[PDB]
Design a protein around this ligand. Structure first.
Ligand code: AMP
Ligand code: AMP
Ligand code: AMP
Ligand code: AMP
Ligand code: F6P
Ligand code: F6P
Ligand code: F6P
Ligand code: F6P
Ligand code: MG
Ligand code: MG
Ligand code: MG
Ligand code: MG
Ligand code: MG
Ligand code: MG
Ligand code: MG
Ligand code: MG
Lengths: 327, 327, 327, 327
């Protein structure tokens, strides 16, 4: 049979005996992601350039792809009636949902990732993490500060050569490809497992001068293998979603470690590291700061950063072992 | 006003007093590229996964994007009545158009570029160069062997977050955005010039062990600038058309130099290097093998390879100076 | 808030305490209807006309819009795991669903209605009726022979100037408009109520010579009102879905009564009359053969026909009263 | 081969040795019509119903399809640099193009026709006629007053189940299907001829009480053919472009004769009757007021009305004979 994202989530909610709130949430996400894909692919851009004159906004307003993404996600999530607290990359403070629209889930998200790659048309995406509320207190920032291990669902949307949504939950990672002709996400890879060992490494080598000793040592070894085999190939798109996705599907390792300008690391823990690290773990892969598991860090700031190394298990441990050795 | 690719092409043909055969040719090229863009974004993919039943072709029974792209290009172009010789990365021999469909142009193209990036949904593209057939004798493969200096037009379509067609001719380089809701390319950026000096470097460092010393030295300055300025950032998508286009839009440098497994460079002279050098040049940048201008190479095989270094003029110039210095 | 069809059905299944089987069914229908809309609007027709040559089917096969509709519906319904018996306009015998895919619902449908209007591009649609299985016996034709009053859900999809799906269930009729850019049905009219009295009548007057006395009398009166007011306007598209939809939204009356060639009437009772008559009743309108209510006819043949008059209550009763008088 | 509207238009312009200004004009017209088609099908309608929030414009604050259509037409056409005078159903006065944008053509159009059918989702269309400006004096409204006999081109886009553009010029009538997945019109039916005699009649019979006796007699023969052949079928969509196009494709007759509330007929000479008569004539059919050819009327007001009878030659001829007979 053919499986659509919409039938998959519903069949998994039925199996789980869920009241449906989460199903409704995911169905929301799936609508938000299409809305975002269409905007990213520039449908309707002729109207910006005056195809029908300029009568159309008497108001002075037109939205950055960034702002619009954020609007779509917030409104679409709020509409699902399934969330109490949202955390966006774009808001300094957690968003507490009005009581009349309040459900039991906490969503951390990057509405659009890969922003240095927007104006040059390289791939970008959306990264999301879902938790259930613990407390019985009035929902607050506190509810979003959970460690990754606690995620109920996570994944991302990539807008590349085509659009793909990847969803991880307790029983695995599935990839669904968007068919833009009918607006339906089609299950295309089931229960995805990352290769033990890859042949690609992905890091911004422009910080070479600022890497700690173990990265430097590891990078060296990718380029001059001591066993004299073939060097890993390099790839670094510049968009976390794209490098992470290539990593899942081809294997290899992706790195964003601490440097001079970011000594805690660049990437955000709540709506960048955590979700990607959850996906990576359901698929049999690893995600470490180099010192601890990423999913085990208990955050204290919704916008806190962390270094991350993620990918194939043999490659990431190879790197961990360099760290262990150096210490 | 609003300027669609169709009106631009037509008006430029009218100004140059063309007979209309080149216009017809770029019009075809514009249609080819929309049909590839839709296949790339996976429209109607639901039919492959049995939405309307008859599941019967599954696994790898049916036609890869690469092949479909090639077909669209060959068939759309023959239909313009403007070509006599086509050379495609995907065909071992030049294609000679039937007399009843012969026009005066030669076209070299890479129907779909960045094939290592297809399965992982990274940006992919189509590259093209157009030549005016000089000889009066029977059209043939040697017709496709002109130096890049001779191009009448070259450019590319990037299938990225959004689809863009970049077209260069004697009077400059223009960027057209594809609005997929109306099937129209919209002129978005006009008479583009690349900046004098960028701060991004693009290369596959996996090959670090194979690099010549100029290349090696140059990477060093990028990471450890002797004068202690900010180090360059690295970006390498793995798709030529994506790396090149970022390089045009953002400035900086792109390299695929010679290595051991590729003593002549990996990239193809006729349908990757030439068009890209032409675009880069008409934009105010440089394209060199390290020793000579790409566009002046005298091609002897239609699938010949070359080393290619391109982008911001000061960046390429600094690298040429390292070459000269290293005898 | 904005309501999508997908969120609406799910919110109504939650309210109803349904296990979800029906929700899954409707979500299926909604996917089938998009798939159908895209095909009807001719996306991809360039491939039929050879945009990429003719390499693409080595097989001799291409589908009528009619056959393809039917494939989409059957397969999509079967996939919902929610149906046991389907009745199609296109199959002489009821379709009994395999046990491993069997649920509790019976669906009668016209995959595409308005076929004399296909080749001239006039509006066409899809008409569906859903029943719950009564028996505990092995599902058979018998399960589909229920009177209309027994419907659980009904509606239709119109593909006109835009695409609209109309859905009626116990608590009303709602219209959702398809937004083809994101593939989502958007609630656009809520709890729809037909006007008491309209000013349009819709019948094929070419059979004038074969109408019974009451129609003739009623038509006369629409054209020469005895109270000397303004005559009704005439409209007859030729597609039941379109004339029925105009009827719901503008008011008026639609007629397909018995004639020489069809003395039982043309339209099918199970997947034409019944569904339209259910919609018409939830909206406060009437549907009569002229002698009995349409929804109260207990069918004995899955393909049985019946005359129908439907529409605004004052207009349809006005017609009934002529019948009553003549008898 | 495959023939797109863009290549047809270009090739016909090349064969006729045009300067390219008319080509540019039909190219614009082709783009106008795709942009209307997408607005008509409701793409991005999700934004109007607050999907990305900011619900603030609701009810009837924002721009009706009719207005958007008009704007697209005026702006796309001025941008072609090929027009000097435009007349639109939606503008009280002719529009005179600015000198810097003046070309030599005059265009009369009905940006969106079948407005009674908009809210009910029935087929709607755009009608156009193009004239060559004869006078050397300042361009003005009288420039738009040529008889239909003078048209260089006329035709229509039908927004139906699928979108089709029908274009007629001196050398015949051609049907192009719009493939909305690539934004290309595909030549689908070439050099169309309407059949000699059809079996469908199209009229609003609601006006039966106002009809002249020729019309009245003619309807009678249609329902009660004196020679006892099969009676004609009736079809009346309520959108001129839909009724007319069915009439071209299927044969038969279309009438909007004079009535009491419309002593001169309702339909407009310049942008409904003229173009349609021209298409019908170039197809081998007839277009008459009942007494004279539509195309020979000498228009005195740009919004003048006329009675119109068109379609299969033998059908119109029979009706003219009834006119003649009734003195
Ligand atoms: N659609 C679904 N897919 C996977 N798990 C679900 C789904 N719905 C509910 N569950 C599981 O059931 C729990 C409670 O469900 P709910 O009653 O929908 O809030 C969730 O937190 C999930 O672990
Ligand atoms: N659409 C166009 N845009 C720019 N230059 C053109 C165009 N068409 C023709 N030309 C120039 O005029 C030459 C002859 O045109 P053609 O007769 O179409 O081959 C070409 O080689 C171009 O240099
Ligand atoms: N999505 C829904 N919308 C409206 N009614 C529903 C829905 N789901 C279930 N119901 C009602 O519940 C009955 C049994 O539901 P189910 O358990 O889904 O087969 C149906 O036959 C409906 O009357
Ligand atoms: N694309 C075209 N298709 C058919 N005829 C054309 C075309 N372009 C020009 N012509 C004919 O040539 C005349 C002058 O062309 P132009 O110089 O473009 O105004 C027009 O009035 C048409 O009769
Ligand atoms: O240019 P840099 O410092 O490598 O940063 C790249 C990272 O920045 C981000 O845009 C921050 O979100 C990531 O998507 C990406 O991996
Ligand atoms: O993996 P490598 O050796 O860097 O090759 C990448 C290059 O290869 C190509 O795919 C050759 O087509 C280019 O698109 C790209 O720049
Ligand atoms: O031409 P006739 O006899 O009026 O039949 C029209 C009817 O035929 C049908 O196509 C039969 O399904 C209906 O959609 C439509 O109302
Ligand atoms: O309702 P009436 O009087 O038949 O008018 C229908 C005619 O009116 C128009 O809408 C006038 O634009 C035509 O499209 C159509 O043929
Ligand atoms: Mg962001
Ligand atoms: Mg981010
Ligand atoms: Mg290629
Ligand atoms: Mg290539
Ligand atoms: Mg049917
Ligand atoms: Mg039918
Ligand atoms: Mg109009
Ligand atoms: Mg009109």
């Amino acid at each position: 049979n053919i499986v659509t994202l919409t039938r998959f989530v519903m069949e998994e909610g039925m199996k789980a005996r869920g009241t449906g709130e989460m199903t409704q949430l995911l169905n929301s996400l799936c609508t938000a992601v299409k809305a975002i894909s269409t905007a990213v692919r520039k449908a309707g851009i002729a109207h910006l350039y005056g195809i029908a004159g300029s009568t159309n906004v008497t108001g002075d307003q037109v939205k950055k792809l960034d702002v619009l993404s954020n609007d779509l996600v917030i409104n679409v999530l709020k509409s699902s009636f399934a969330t109490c607290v949202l955390v966006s990359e774009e808001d300094k403070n957690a968003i507490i949902v009005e009581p009349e629209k309040r459900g039991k889930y906490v969503v951390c998200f990057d509405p659009l990732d890969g922003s240095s790659n927007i104006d040059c048309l390289v791939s970008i995406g959306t990264i999301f993490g879902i938790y259930r509320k613990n407390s019985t207190d009035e929902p607050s920032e506190k509810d979003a500060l959970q460690p990754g291990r606690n995620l109920v669902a996570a994944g991302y949307a990539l807008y590349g050569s085509a659009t793909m949504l990847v969803l991880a939950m307790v029983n695995g990672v599935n990839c669904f490809m968007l068919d833009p002709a009918i607006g339906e996400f089609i299950l295309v890879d089931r229960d995805v497992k990352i290769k033990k060992k890859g042949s690609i490494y992905s890091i911004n080598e422009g910080y070479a001068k600022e890497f700690d000793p173990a990265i430097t040592e590891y990078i060296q070894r990718k380029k001059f293998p001591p066993d004299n085999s073939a060097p890993y190939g390099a790839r670094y798109v510049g968009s976390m979603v794209a490098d992470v996705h290539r990593t899942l599907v081809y294997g290899g390792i992706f790195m964003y470690p601490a440097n001079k300008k970011s000594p805690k690391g660049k990437l955000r823990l709540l709506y960048e590291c955590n979700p990607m690290a959850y996906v990576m773990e359901k698929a049999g892969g690893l995600a470490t700061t180099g010192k601890e598991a990423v999913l085990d860090i208990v955050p204290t700031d919704i916008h806190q950063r962390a270094p991350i190394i993620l990918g194939s298990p043999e490659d990431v441990t190879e790197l961990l072992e360099i760290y262990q050795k150096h210490a």
